[PDB]
Design a protein around this nucleic acid. Structure first.
Ligand SMILES: [K+]
Ligand SMILES: [K+]
Ligand SMILES: [K+]
Ligand SMILES: [K+]
Ligand SMILES: [K+]
Ligand SMILES: [K+]
Ligand SMILES: [Mg+2]
Ligand SMILES: [Mg+2]
Ligand SMILES: [Mg+2]
Ligand SMILES: [Mg+2]
Lengths: 142, 208, 62, 51, 238, 126
RNA sequence: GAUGAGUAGGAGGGCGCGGCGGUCGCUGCAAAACCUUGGGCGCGAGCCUGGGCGGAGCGGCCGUCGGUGCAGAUCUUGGU
RNA sequence: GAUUGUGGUAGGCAGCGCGCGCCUCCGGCGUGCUUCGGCAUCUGCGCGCUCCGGACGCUGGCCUGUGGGCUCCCCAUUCGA
RNA sequence: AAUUGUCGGGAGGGAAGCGGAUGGGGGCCGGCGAUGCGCCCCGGUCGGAUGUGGAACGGUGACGAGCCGGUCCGCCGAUCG
């Protein structure tokens, strides 16, 4: 966002290539966002990966329980190739959670989405474990 | 330590005495006198620090809603005045519907402990809900019956074969009950016979 | 039944937001909405109300 | 210059309870009702005892 | 560890100041609430004593008039309670306008009304559409307690606390439900303000029904002035 | 997946609003049409006649559009589209579009099983 | 917090059809169309989906355009 | 007796008990005002209770069954039309 | 699609169809309806400091200094997860 994120949001909230809309524009309308740097894939100014200078990106790496945690560099906004500071974590979930907290909240990067980042990390870790060892429980009991 | 209530309740939530009389009885004047014309100040109780809960293994994607506090606490189930120890009860439901049994005591859960006696009508020591029972005016002495060791836990399922210990306990309990029953003539037949409604019998008119 | 005009509902229409699609004007509207809410200033309220007005209702000044 | 932020304005409407039935609401609206009830009950008890 | 940014420090400091001022305001409010509770207790006691003394004085005056052999004319009622008994269909313009001015827009709505020549002449025009009388202390107390709703910013708020009354009528010294009841019953200096603050009462259909709403109460119907007999109707309607 | 919804689903009416006289004339379809005739008893709301829909029948907003299983529907056309529900598996369920082939449906089902995302029609084309 | 009638008529928000500029997708491991006491969503216009048939294309979304929505017209053509 | 639990970060508001004094404990003992009954006159803290800022708790049946559900279909019946 | 034949189900005292409520029968539905969670013991795998070096890099500051910081790799201890 070489221009202010508020302006970027004012422009892109109406339409963008990452916006997914379904079931019309009535009460049935469902909206989501596809950009990889949106923790909750939600079409909102808070989580938008296009209208924020500081953005958190959490996904699964190719192999070996490697989780990619990337942060958008505040000064390299005009350099897409080097816009993301990446870190591939292969250690335990505890260490991954500590690293995510340190890189998201302890430095006042984006404290408002610390919970979202932790939840996304937990979901990615669970997905990787299930992809490795197959489904073993239905997760239907409350 | 005061051994009697200072303010008896005329009704629920209203005391018999006013604030001035309560002051006089509680003796706040005495405490002020002894402390030097000023009430003693007591420091607030120190809260216990929360335990060092280990970090969670998972982080939910949604914030579960915590229910609001409910200030109402259930009270013990009330026992109808028509039901007293030794009262004869009529069962209106279940496999023993219509049977006449003897009431022994009310358990902690609120259910009623009853006995046939087992020999007279085949009804053992059992729990019956008060809502499915009719209390009659017939009373039998039960002072000689000891059921102290029997409580709500006696009937708890351990989860087909009845232990001999329960049979022995039933016999021991029923010996005194039958001995007391024998005093009243025809009470044996009354307890051995079930209750039924015949032609032109109106429950709303029967007194019981 | 209740003896009310139109069920007690209003029948007057006033602007509650700009009809324009100018993003800069929208940002100004957000700014002055916040100012009006958190300051209760009559000047800010007047500015916010005038930000909604149409072109002919915002005449130029020589 | 902003005024202090407010977080306790969106309180749920308190359910209306008839003071004529439950005592606590009656006392909250009018504390003297407690004294009135106490005096009335005591006077009735005294009259019954005398009779 | 990580140095705290100046923006965070400033926000925390201002939050601390706001919390401190809020705590001070809460303490002051608690103290004032204690004093207000004491005051309203004393005022309610005084009002109850006043009502009892008034009843005793009326009885004594009647008895002494009989003893002297003359007649005692009771003071004319200063307060009326009016209940609409007809629907909104096929209304004449004058009747509809008068009912709006009396704030009776729905069948079985009730309102208090101070007795005046102007108000009485207004009510005389709509007599067939309403029934009214002289409310009791019990009637007024029960109406305000069970169905009393106050008007705050043109909104209808239930009188679940004395603060609702204080917010609107505090300037006039009315800060409690008992104060409101006393003002209404005695038609005090601020009766107009208190009555306007009171939202029109939405009464249920009569528990025992009506006799005939198409006839005056004098002929055996329901319309018109039924004086002291409005109280039993209020019992059945509340 | 444990649905987040807790309030019971209440339907004010479960019957369809059928067009008047669609039973009588074949050419008149069932899809609702409001009568505009001057004398129409249905338009006038004569009792014992066909009922007309109105906003009063509106579903409670908390339970609106919720399927009986307690989740909300989202149509997915590929496994890439499936991942959008990774952080909403307790509120949203995925339904595979009718035109997806069996080969892609298998991959979508496997990915949804990995992601703990409910599929409403996971047995189709099997 | 209050409130809910509507012909003629006005307006708002939405549903549906066919193109164009973009964007995101589906399809011989079976598209469109059609069929179905399969199922579900929406107050509703409608929409999503199971199964069948069919055997080559089609859809969602943002703008924008139009020869764009039928029960009537002794309506037109064809069929019964 | 009947209908019903809308909300979900609050121990709030109101009223009241036990300890902070003693005795001989269905109660009694201090200062003021009383209509001689009584009184929000002294009424402060800590811990608690309640008709107190919208329902909680226990038990049972059943879970591949001749079970449960249904907005689907064909019918019958009462009312309407 | 109108319309028609056949088989199967059903109904029928001078229309049929239709709105509302149940019921009989049929049809359909397994996200139709769960079996997990916490604390311990045994066994199997994978990693384990605030120490010491290397690779690339970030927050802030001023896309300087300074301060702070995470990821990965190599070792001495630690013997935990
Ligand atoms: K048709
Ligand atoms: K309408
Ligand atoms: K397209
Ligand atoms: K279909
Ligand atoms: K278009
Ligand atoms: K109840
Ligand atoms: Mg009303
Ligand atoms: Mg007339
Ligand atoms: Mg064309
Ligand atoms: Mg055909």
């Amino acid at each position: 966002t070489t221009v202010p994120g508020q302006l970027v949001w004012e422009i892109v909230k109406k339409n963008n290539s990452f916006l997914v809309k379904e079931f019309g524009n009535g009460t049935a309308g469902v909206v989501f966002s596809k950009e990889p740097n949106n923790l909750y894939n939600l079409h909102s100014y808070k989580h938008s990966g296009l209208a924020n200078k500081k953005t958190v990106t959490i996904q699964a790496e190719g192999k070996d329980k490697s989780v990619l945690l990337a942060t958008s560099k505040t000064k390299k906004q005009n350099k897409p190739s080097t816009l993301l500071n990446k870190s591939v974590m292969k250690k335990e979930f505890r260490r991954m959670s500590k690293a995510v907290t340190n890189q998201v909240a302890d430095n006042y990067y984006r404290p408002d989405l610390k919970k979202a980042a932790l939840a996304r990390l937990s979901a990615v870790n669970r997905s990787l474990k299930v992809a490795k060892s197959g489904v073993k429980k239905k997760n239907r009991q409350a | 330590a005061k051994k009697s209530p200072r303010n008896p309740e005329l009704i629920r939530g209203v005391g018999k005495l006013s604030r001035s009389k309560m002051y006089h009885k509680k003796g706040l004047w005495a405490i002020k006198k002894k402390n030097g014309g000023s009430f003693p100040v007591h420091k607030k109780a120190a809260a216990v620090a929360p335990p060092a809960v280990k970090p969670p293994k998972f982080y939910p994607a949604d914030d579960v809603a915590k229910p609001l506090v409910n200030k109402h606490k259930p009270k013990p189930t009330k026992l109808r005045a028509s039901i007293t120890p030794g009262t004869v009860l009529i069962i209106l439901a279940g496999r023993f519907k219509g049977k006449r049994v003897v009431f022994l005591k009310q358990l902690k859960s609120g259910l009623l402990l009853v006995s046939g006696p087992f020999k007279l009508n085949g009804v053992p020591l059992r729990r019956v809900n008060q809502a499915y029972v009719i209390g009659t005016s017939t009373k039998v002495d039960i002072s000689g019956v000891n059921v102290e060791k029997i409580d709500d836990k006696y009937f708890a399922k351990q989860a087909n074969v009845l232990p001999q210990g329960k049979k022995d306990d039933q016999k021991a309990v029923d010996e005194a009950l039958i001995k007391a029953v024998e005093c009243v003539p025809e009470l044996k037949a009354y307890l051995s016979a079930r209750f039924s409604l015949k032609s032109c019998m109106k429950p709303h008119e029967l007194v019981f | 039944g209740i003896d009310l005009k139109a069920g007690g509902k209003s029948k007057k229409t006033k602007r509650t937001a700009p009809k324009s699609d100018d993003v800069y004007l929208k940002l100004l509207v957000k700014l002055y909405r916040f100012l009006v809410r958190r300051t209760g200033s009559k000047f800010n309220a007047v500015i916010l109300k005038r930000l909604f007005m149409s072109k002919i209702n915002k005449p130029p000044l020589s | 210059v902003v005024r202090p932020i407010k977080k306790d304005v969106n309180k749920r409407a308190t359910l209306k309870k008839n003071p004529l039935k439950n005592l606590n609401v009656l006392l909250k609206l009018n504390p003297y009702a407690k004294t009135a009830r106490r005096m009335s009950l005591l006077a009735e008890a005294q009259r019954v005892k005398a009779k | 560890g990580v140095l705290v940014p100046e923006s965070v420090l400033k926000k925390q400091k201002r939050s601390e100041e706001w919390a401190l001022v809020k705590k001070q305001e809460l303490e002051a409010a608690k103290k004032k609430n204690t004093e207000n509770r004491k005051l309203i207790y004393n005022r309610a006691k005084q009002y109850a004593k006043e009502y009892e003394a008034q009843e005793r004085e009326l009885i004594q005056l009647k008895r002494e008039a009989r003893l002297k052999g003359g007649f005692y004319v009771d003071p004319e009622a200063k307060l009326l309670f009016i209940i609409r008994i007809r629907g909104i269909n096929a209304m004449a313009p004058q009747t509809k306008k008068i009912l709006q001015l009396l704030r009776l827009r729905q069948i079985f709505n009730g309102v208090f009304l101070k007795v005046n020549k102007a108000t009485v002449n207004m009510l005389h025009r709509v007599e067939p559409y309403v029934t009214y009388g002289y409310p009791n202390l019990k009637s007024i107390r029960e109406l305000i307690y069970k169905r009393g709703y106050g008007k705050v910013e043109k909104q209808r708020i239930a009188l679940t606390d004395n603060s609702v009354i204080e917010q609107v009528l505090g300037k006039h010294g009315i800060i409690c439900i008992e104060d409101l009841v006393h003002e209404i019953i005695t038609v005090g200096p601020h009766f107009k303000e208190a009555n306007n603050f009171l939202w029109p009462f939405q009464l249920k259909a009569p528990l025992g029904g009506l006799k005939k709403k198409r006839n005056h109460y004098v002929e055996g119907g329901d319309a018109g002035n039924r004086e002291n007999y409005i109280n039993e109707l209020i019992r059945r309607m509340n | 997946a444990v649905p987040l919804l807790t309030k019971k689903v209440v339907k004010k009416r479960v019957k369809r609003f059928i067009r008047p006289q669609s039973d009588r004339r074949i050419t008149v379809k069932e899809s609702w049409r409001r009568p505009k005739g001057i004398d129409s008893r249905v338009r006038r709301k004569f009792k014992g006649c066909v009922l007309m829909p109105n906003i009063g029948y509106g579903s409670d907003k908390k339970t609106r559009h919720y399927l009986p299983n307690g989740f909300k529907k989202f149509v997915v056309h590929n496994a890439s589209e499936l991942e959008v529900l990774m952080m909403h598996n307790r509120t949203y369920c995925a339904e595979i579009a009718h035109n997806v082939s069996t080969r892609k449906r298998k991959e979508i089902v496997e990915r949804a099983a990995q992601l703990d995302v409910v599929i409403t029609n996971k047995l189709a084309r099997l």
